[PDB]
Every structure is written in C-alpha cells, then in structure tokens.
Amino acid sequence: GLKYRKLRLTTKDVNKGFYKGNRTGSMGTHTSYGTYKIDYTKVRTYVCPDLTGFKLTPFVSKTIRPVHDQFPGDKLGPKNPATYLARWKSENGLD
Amino acid sequence: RGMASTKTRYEVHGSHKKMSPQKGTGNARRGTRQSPLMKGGGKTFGPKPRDFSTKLNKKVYDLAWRTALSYRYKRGELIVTEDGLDLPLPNDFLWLAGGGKLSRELED
Amino acid sequence: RQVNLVLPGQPTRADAPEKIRDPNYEPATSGAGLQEI
Amino acid sequence: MDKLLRRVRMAEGMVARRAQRKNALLKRITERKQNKKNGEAFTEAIQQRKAAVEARNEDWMLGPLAPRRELDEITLSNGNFFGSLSPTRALLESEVSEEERKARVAWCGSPKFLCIAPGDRVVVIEGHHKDLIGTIEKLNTRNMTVEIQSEKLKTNTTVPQFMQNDADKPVTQIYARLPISSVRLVHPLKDPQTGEYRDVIIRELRPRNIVHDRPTRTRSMRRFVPGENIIIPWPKQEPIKREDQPADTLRIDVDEKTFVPTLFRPPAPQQVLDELRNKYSIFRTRHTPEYIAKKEQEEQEKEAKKSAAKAMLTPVQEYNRKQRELRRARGQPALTEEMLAKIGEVVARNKLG
Amino acid sequence: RNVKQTMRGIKHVLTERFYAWEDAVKLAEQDPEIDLSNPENPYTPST
Amino acid sequence: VNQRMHEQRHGDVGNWRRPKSQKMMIAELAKPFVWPKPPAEDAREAFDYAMWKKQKTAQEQDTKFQGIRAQGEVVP
Amino acid sequence: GPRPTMSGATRLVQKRRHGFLSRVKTKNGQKTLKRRLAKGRLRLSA
RNA sequence: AUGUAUUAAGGAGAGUAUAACUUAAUUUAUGUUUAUGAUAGAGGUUAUCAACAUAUGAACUCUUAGAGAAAUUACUUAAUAAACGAAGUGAAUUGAAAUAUCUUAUUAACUUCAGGAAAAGAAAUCAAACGAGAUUCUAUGAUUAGUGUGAACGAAAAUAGAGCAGCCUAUUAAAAUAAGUAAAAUGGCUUUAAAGCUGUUUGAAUAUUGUGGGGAACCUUCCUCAAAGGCUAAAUAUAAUACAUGAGUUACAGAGAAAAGUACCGUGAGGGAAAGCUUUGAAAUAGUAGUUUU
Numbered sequence A: 001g002l003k004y005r006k007l008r009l010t011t012k013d014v015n016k017g018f019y020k021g022n023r024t025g026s027m028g029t030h031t032s033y034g035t036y037k038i039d040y041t042k043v044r045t046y047v048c049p050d051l052t053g054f055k056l057t058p059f060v061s062k063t064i065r066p067v068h069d070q071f072p073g074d075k076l077g078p079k080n081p082a083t084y085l086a087r088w089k090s091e092n093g094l095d
Numbered sequence B: 001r002g003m004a005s006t007k008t009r010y011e012v013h014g015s016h017k018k019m020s021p022q023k024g025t026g027n028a029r030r031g032t033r034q035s036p037l038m039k040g041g042g043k044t045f046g047p048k049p050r051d052f053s054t055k056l057n058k059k060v061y062d063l064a065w066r067t068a069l070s071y072r073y074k075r076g077e078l079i080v081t082e083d084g085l086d087l088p089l090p091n092d093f094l095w096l097a098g099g100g101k102l103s104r105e106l107e108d
Numbered sequence C: 001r002q003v004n005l006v007l008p009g010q011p012t013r014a015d016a017p018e019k020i021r022d023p024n025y026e027p028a029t030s031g032a033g034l035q036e037i
Numbered sequence D: 001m002d003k004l005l006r007r008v009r010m011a012e013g014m015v016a017r018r019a020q021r022k023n024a025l026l027k028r029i030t031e032r033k034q035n036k037k038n039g040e041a042f043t044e045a046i047q048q049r050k051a052a053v054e055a056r057n058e059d060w061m062l063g064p065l066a067p068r069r070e071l072d073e074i075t076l077s078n079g080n081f082f083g084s085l086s087p088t089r090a091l092l093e094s095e096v097s098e099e100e101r102k103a104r105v106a107w108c109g110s111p112k113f114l115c116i117a118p119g120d121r122v123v124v125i126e127g128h129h130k131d132l133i134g135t136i137e138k139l140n141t142r143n144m145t146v147e148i149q150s151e152k153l154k155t156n157t158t159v160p161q162f163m164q165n166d167a168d169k170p171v172t173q174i175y176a177r178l179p180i181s182s183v184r185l186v187h188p189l190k191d192p193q194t195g196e197y198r199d200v201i202i203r204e205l206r207p208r209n210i211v212h213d214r215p216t217r218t219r220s221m222r223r224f225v226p227g228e229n230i231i232i233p234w235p236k237q238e239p240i241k242r243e244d245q246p247a248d249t250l251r252i253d254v255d256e257k258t259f260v261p262t263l264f265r266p267p268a269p270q271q272v273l274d275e276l277r278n279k280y281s282i283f284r285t286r287h288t289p290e291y292i293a294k295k296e297q298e299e300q301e302k303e304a305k306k307s308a309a310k311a312m313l314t315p316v317q318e319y320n321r322k323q324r325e326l327r328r329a330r331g332q333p334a335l336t337e338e339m340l341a342k343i344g345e346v347v348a349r350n351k352l353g
Numbered sequence E: 001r002n003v004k005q006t007m008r009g010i011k012h013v014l015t016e017r018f019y020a021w022e023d024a025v026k027l028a029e030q031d032p033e034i035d036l037s038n039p040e041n042p043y044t045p046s047t
Numbered sequence F: 001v002n003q004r005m006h007e008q009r010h011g012d013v014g015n016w017r018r019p020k021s022q023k024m025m026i027a028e029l030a031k032p033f034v035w036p037k038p039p040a041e042d043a044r045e046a047f048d049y050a051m052w053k054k055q056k057t058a059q060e061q062d063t064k065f066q067g068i069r070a071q072g073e074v075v076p
Numbered sequence G: 001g002p003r004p005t006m007s008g009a010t011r012l013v014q015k016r017r018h019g020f021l022s023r024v025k026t027k028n029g030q031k032t033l034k035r036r037l038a039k040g041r042l043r044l045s046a
Numbered sequence H: 001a002u003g004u005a006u007u008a009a010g011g012a013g014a015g016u017a018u019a020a021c022u023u024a025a026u027u028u029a030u031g032u033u034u035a036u037g038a039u040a041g042a043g044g045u046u047a048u049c050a051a052c053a054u055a056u057g058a059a060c061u062c063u064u065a066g067a068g069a070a071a072u073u074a075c076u077u078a079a080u081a082a083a084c085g086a087a088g089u090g091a092a093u094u095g096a097a098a099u100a101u102c103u104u105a106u107u108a109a110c111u112u113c114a115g116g117a118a119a120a121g122a123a124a125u126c127a128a129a130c131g132a133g134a135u136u137c138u139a140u141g142a143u144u145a146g147u148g149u150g151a152a153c154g155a156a157a158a159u160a161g162a163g164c165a166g167c168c169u170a171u172u173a174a175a176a177u178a179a180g181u182a183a184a185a186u187g188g189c190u191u192u193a194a195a196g197c198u199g200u201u202u203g204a205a206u207a208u209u210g211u212g213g214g215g216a217a218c219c220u221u222c223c224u225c226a227a228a229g230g231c232u233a234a235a236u237a238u239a240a241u242a243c244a245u246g247a248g249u250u251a252c253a254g255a256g257a258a259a260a261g262u263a264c265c266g267u268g269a270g271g272g273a274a275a276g277c278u279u280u281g282a283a284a285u286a287g288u289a290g291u292u293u294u
C-alpha cells in the first residue's frame, strides 16, 4: 500500500462492478435480462453536404492581405440589428 | 519606522507534536519542531514591531532649537533675507517654460 | 518677443544616400574622426 | 434579469482569477529554465576569460617553449576548440529579459517603435572591432541583435556534430551578431555652411508622425534626430514576395457574395445554434422570454410567502396597520412665512435684544 | 493552425447571424413597414 | 481504449496525474484497402531523412548516457 | 513493531472508507473536506 | 510588519499556439491620443512594431438534480468554502509552591442560525441636591472601590480620541403603550448582599393631582427614569486584492512554501520537505611537491 494507491482509480485497475464510462452518451436503455436496446432517436448522425463542385478551400492566398470590416459611428457595427433589417429589406424582402 | 518582525517558537508554522520519543532512541530529546534549536525554528528574542520614540521636554527641545540657531549665528552661517525668497530665474526662460515651447529635457 | 535662448528649429528632411549626386563625396570606411550628433 | 447578470459576472471573475494563478506560475517556470540556459553562455565567457589569464602568464614565462594550444583537444567543460566560440554565443541566440530588450534599443526608440531597419549603415562602438562601419543584413527583434556581414566580424565557431558529416571540419568561421546598443547609425547629412555631404554618426533616433490603420492593423511613421530635428528617410527595403499556391482559393471565389439575410427563417437550422454555444452554460447571457419569466416568478413566490401571515392578523392589528397608511398620507405640517417671521422675532429678541 | 482559424471564423459568423437575426425580428415587430402576420407579402416600401 | 502512463505535471516535478486515454477503432470494411509500403531510407530525402537521422542518433546517445548515469555509473 | 496490515487490501474498501462520497454525505466528512480544502490539499479523499 | 483604498463565495479534474487559456483554448468592433505621445517605411506566423477607454463571440467536467466507488451514470438553460458574528453547551493542563472553594475561564472546543459585516442601540440609564443625555471601538480612571481565608479576580461615574442620527409618517412599512408580566418563596447562574438571567410553586398597580422601576442589605422622603411593543447609517471583526512606507529579511534568512501544502510518510484523520543566480571560495578532509626530522 504505497504511492500507486494514491492515484485516481480507473476501470483498468480494478474489477468487481467498477464501471465508469467515457461520456459517449446514452444510445438506448438496459433490459432486465442484461442486454441493451438501442433508441435511434438518441443515436446521432453527421450531416455532411455534397462537396462536388465546391471551389472554396480552407486557405486564402496571401496576395489578398487580411482586412477587417469598418463601421464608422456604429458601436455595435457587425451586431447591429438595424443594419441586419435594413440590409434585409433591400436584398431580400419576400423571405 | 520600527516595523521589523520575527517569529518566535509560538508563531512558527507546523504542529506542536513531540518529534522523538522522550527516550529509547539514543538521541537528544526533542519537543516541538518550532524550537530555536531546530533548523527552521523561531528566534527567541527577535525584533518585534514596537515604538522606538522617546520623550523630550518641550522646554529642552526649544532650548536645543535656539542653541542650533545660535551656533549658526555666532559662526556667520545664518543669513536672514527679506521676504519673497526665491531663485531669480531669467524672465526669458520663465516665459518659454510657461508657454510650453521648452521640452522637459531642456527645461530641466 | 525674441528670447536670448536658441531652441531646436523646425524639422527638416535629409536626402537619402541614393539621391546624393555630389561628386566630391565618398562614404566613410571607419568611424574614426566622424562627427556625432 | 439583474440576478442572472450577477451570475455571469461572478463566474467570469472566478475563471479570470484561476488563469492568473496558473499564468503567474508558468511565467516563473519558464524564466527559471531560460535563465539556466543563458547561464551556459555566461559560464563559457567566464571560463574563457580565466583561461586567457592563464595563457598570457604561460607565454610570458616559457618563451621559446610556449605550447601550441591550437593543436590541443577540445575543452570538455564546454566542448569548444581553441579560439572558437559557441554557436549560441557567436549568434547571440539567448533569450533576454524584456527589461534588457528595452535597453538595447534605448537609443533608437522602443522595441515596439523601432527606428532602425535592415539596409542601414551602422558603426560599431564597442568591443575589439570599434569604429567598424558596415551595412545591416538582417535584424532579429526577439533578442534585439543585428548582423553585419563584415569580414572582420567573422569568428571561429565549434559546429555541433548532429549537423555535420564525418568528412567536414569541426570548426568554421561565421559572422558574429551584435546587440543594437553596440552600434549607431551612419548617415550623410548636408553641411549647411559648406554645402558638401559628409558621413555623420547619429547618437539617437526617435519616431515621429505615427499613424495606425486599424482595419489593416498596419503602422507607418518617420524617424528623426532629436535636438537637430533632421528627419532621416527609411532605407530601401524589399517587401516579401507573396504568391498564390494551388491549395488556396481563387480570388474570384473569395470575393463572391452569397449571403442574403432572412427574417421568417433563421440563417441556419435552429439545431446549429446548440453546437455554436452551450445551451446550459453559466456564461449564457441571451435567454428566452419564458426562462426570464420563470425566474421572476420564483422571486415573486418568495415575496408572497413572507406576506402570507397577513391572513392571520387580528382585527386590532389590521386597524393599526390601516391608520399608518392614513397617517403617512397626511404628511408633515409646513411652517408658513407668517409663522417663520414670528419665530425670528423670538430668536433676535433672545439673542441681540 | 490555419485550418483551425478558418473553422473559428465560421463559428463566429454563424453565431453573429443568429443573434443579429433574433434581434432584427424583435425590431421588426415594432416596424410599421413590416407585417409579420402575412408572410406572402410582409414588406411594403414606405412612401 | 488505450490508457496513458501516470506522470508528474512537470515531468520530474509536480503532482502525479494521468493524461486522457486514447481510443482506437477497427472497422470491418466491405471493400478491402491496402496501404502503400513505407519508402526506403534512400528515397526519404524529400523529408530530409539524412539530417533527421543524425539528430535522432544524437538524441539516442543522450538518452543512453543519461541511463548509464541513472544507474549510478559513468563511461570509462 | 509495525505489521503488514495492507496485505490483501482491496481498492473497493478504500473508496468506501476514504472516498469522496463517503465524506460529502456525512456531517463529520464535510469537516474533513473543509479542513483539507483550507490547507490547500489537492487530494481531498482516497 | 503596519497603514490606506477597494471588494464580499471558494477549489479541483481534464484539455489547449509552453507569455497568450477552455474543444472558438491568440474572437469581433467603437472612440480618442499617437513622440509636443503615453507614463509619410518594413512587418498577418519572417505574425501579434499600440497604448488608453467603451462594448463584444466563446468559455468543457466535478464539487452542485437523482444514484454512485467526486470528475461517472443519467438528465438539465439543476449551482455559495474558510475566517469573522450571535446564541446554546462548556472543559483540562495551569496557579494557589499539596488540595476540594477559587483560579485557569462566560476561555478552547462543539452545535444551531445569519450577513457582508454581525451584534448592540435612542434610557423603567447614570448621577447626587449640581447635572449628564442611545449604541459601538481605543486609552485613562484602575496592580482603584470592592470581592476572596488565600492565590488572585476586578467595576462604574468621569475624561480623551474614533465616529456621531435620530425616530414611530420608524424612508419600508411595526404599538390601539403591553399581566401569568413586575415581584415573592425555593433550587441555581451572575454577583459585593443590589441590579440582571432562570426551573418549580405563587402572584401587583395605573402617571408629577406622585401610579410603577431604580438610586448596592432594608425602610422612608426626595431625585431620576417610564419594563412587559418596535426601526435605525457610521466608527468595529474577518478574508481577498492593490498600493505606500521600512536603522524589516536577502536563500539553514524571510513563510512551511523564490516551481508547495507539491514531493514524500501515513489505512485514515493527519504530518510535511529539499531546491535561487553567471560572482567569491573559509575550515575540516584527501593525494602530491619543496625544506627538514625519523
């Protein structure tokens, strides 16, 4: 009984009912027989669109120097709800 | 100022447990770890924050004040001038400094 | 009013070494004897 | 809600206090590891200075028996040959304190406002190679050192073996770096009374006409000589060559605008907002009207609870509580200017006569 | 690193539109030119 | 799941802790997939394998010298 | 003299006797945690 | 160490550009001044070559729903350490050169409840024949009056300073002016025998047109106040942070900790290190050399 006992207990260190998950998420329910029924309403899917014909890449050429947006006289420049609404009427008024 | 402070064996950190058994070890008997004989023990008669000020009668202090003025007077080291005693700096420099033309470096 | 003290005048521009066309002018090889400002 | 804002401000302070405790500890661990690494260069310079004290005396006494130290083995204390420096000490790659950086450029402005650039002709004012004039090739702003590719500044250096073949020679000569405090600018100025151009040494420089560009995060300023107020142009510097790589997006596709605001449908599926921010975070500041309403209700239920005993009041208790409402409504009687005058007559009569 | 910065910007603009859109809806509720009840023609350019 | 060794926060100093574990997954493919064979040491020059091998050797000798010292011994 | 009292010891008893839950759920255990928290201990239990 | 100012819930786990801190781990904007600042270039990773001020995105897990072997499960826009405060309970070491009363001591400690402070508070108070005018903190009064066989314990008036605030219509919402109360006997606490607290058994009066309490056994006259209903800031305590000062420390010092409640010891409560830098190199100790003796 020495230094190793003072470390945090892990599932690979002991048996006899010590269960500790890894935050994967509940994908169903347990049964009384010792089995598991998967609930596909809890199962998660990954929505990846179609990347055929997509011209954008995660990089922009360094010939185009970085530039930030300017909103003179507007404290909440990019977060202005009026600019979002005013910009909506002119561009898209239907939806 | 008189603010120096040191810790005694009654203020040093740690537990007041007995270090070694009273006997049977063959070593010198020991009590607490905070003893001055121990490595990180407390200085017995160390400095403490106190008042170093002394008293002096108002009449003796007033005699010492005029005695210092008399020492300078009888030696010619006491020069009394008219009121308004200030260094007569040139008016040109005084006009620049106020105006802000002169930098701090040049002004000093 | 004019004062008796000389103050640093207004700033001036110094010609770049590439634009100096003075014939009788050779760069210095050692910093011995050169003026310091 | 007022009570929900205090919840966020309190949490923001706890995490800020935790980060400062960890940062303060990490700054000291790195400062101890760096000072210990710089000590290796100090120890070398100290060992070489003491060796020169032993060598000068030996040469004076032996005379015709002076040893050929250049043919001896390396010094295991540092691994250097005879008359050879270390790459760390010949290149001055040691990281210095931030107080030292400000001192190395005290004569040419500030570390973040630097008035010396590569391409300027400087003059050495310290060391063995004093009065040596050369042109700057590169400038390192981390240690505030400068490289002058002059033949006289070359010095023997012991090359480590992890980057050298078995057929190459262990020692080589490389240009030695110097701190910016050991050099001064050399610029030709027109002599106003004579009209000829001669080189002068500039002892001090300062920035002037500073203007920032927040959109581009750029900065352009000028440099001048204090006292004489002589604006010295910048040296001709070549901008870095920016190229378009195959992995980069085409300019036509980067500038293409495709976003059109909407009002009746969110900009993206509502489910995405749960992946952008945490729905149950203690730092959430934008809540729903139902959530804020429920929070206000809890405080209203506590209020009504403290006021629940009003139904257990006796008729006398209700009578006295009602009289206060009426009494407090009467207000405080006012003193008319007619009465204030009659009071002043008593004050003056009993004070003056 | 450059790929991670691009992903950070994507999350910033999307979170910015969600809040900018949530606030514009409220601002539109008090706008006389916009009528949120009828969706087929909710906007009428003011005279 | 692959567990990580318990270590001190700062290597030789600090409290004893354990990094997060690693998870590996083996999928049974419907279509086979074969990996290319690693290039030969003579063809890895695009990665500067020559300089990388010299540095690796020096690091191996440094850890070997430390191991001899950790045994309380020195190289005669 | 000392004895080998940790021979055959199990870690299920350590968690039951000295574990975190053994202390937050008791009146005297809360004092232990609060004492060790005041001293600055990282290991509050087990 | 003290003082000043501000503030009033604390920690851990894991992860991450190893100055940069939360899976967004170096977010995005506004204004002003920019060398006469503040206190006519190059440079987007060869980066952050700009400070101040005002906003702003993100901010995981546990302590902290339930359960459990904290950092898991399963759910969900679930969430508050210590110290300080008041009351209740309440020792012993020790001193008396033993020891019971006493002292230690309305102490330590424990429990409950509460807030940024809490408590207390505008006289049923003190004085003495004159008068003062709530509470709190410090000093003097005071090794005093006094108590005790002793050992020892120990006020108040008043004074000075810090603060100052009065009210019930309380600047937050309360009284129809207080009866099982005042008081007595008895058992205790406190204590000088009074006053004050209290279990048991009993049990009043109605205002200066002299009703009630107090003025140190007790009665009387007089003076003084008006219980059995309440509100009230400041000066005070504690912790954290910042700053100022030093005949304070300068590495076996200062702190336990110049990388610490870490390493390490212990089943556990708990105990608890060493370790600065590039300078200087004393003694002891070891192997030699020179002179000399053996």
Ligand SMILES: [K+]
Binding pocket: B016, B017
């Ligand atoms: K003890």
Ligand SMILES: [K+]
Binding pocket: none
């Ligand atoms: K009486």
Ligand SMILES: [Mg+2]
Binding pocket: A012, A013, A014
């Ligand atoms: Mg195993």
Ligand SMILES: [Mg+2]
Binding pocket: A013, A014, A015
């Ligand atoms: Mg096993």
Ligand SMILES: [Mg+2]
Binding pocket: A017
């Ligand atoms: Mg089980």
Ligand SMILES: [Mg+2]
Binding pocket: B040, B041, B042
């Ligand atoms: Mg000490």
Ligand SMILES: [Mg+2]
Binding pocket: D218, D219, D220
């Ligand atoms: Mg530019």
Ligand SMILES: [Mg+2]
Binding pocket: D275, D276, D277, D278
């Ligand atoms: Mg996220």
Ligand SMILES: [Mg+2]
Binding pocket: D283, D284, D285
């Ligand atoms: Mg937020």
Ligand SMILES: [Mg+2]
Binding pocket: G001
């Ligand atoms: Mg035994």
Ligand SMILES: [Mg+2]
Binding pocket: G007, G008, G009
């Ligand atoms: Mg057993």
Ligand SMILES: [Mg+2]
Binding pocket: none
């Ligand atoms: Mg729970």
Ligand SMILES: [Mg+2]
Binding pocket: none
């Ligand atoms: Mg939970």
Ligand SMILES: [Mg+2]
Binding pocket: H096, H098
């Ligand atoms: Mg006796």
Ligand SMILES: [Mg+2]
Binding pocket: none
């Ligand atoms: Mg007496």
Ligand SMILES: [Mg+2]
Binding pocket: H177
């Ligand atoms: Mg009454």
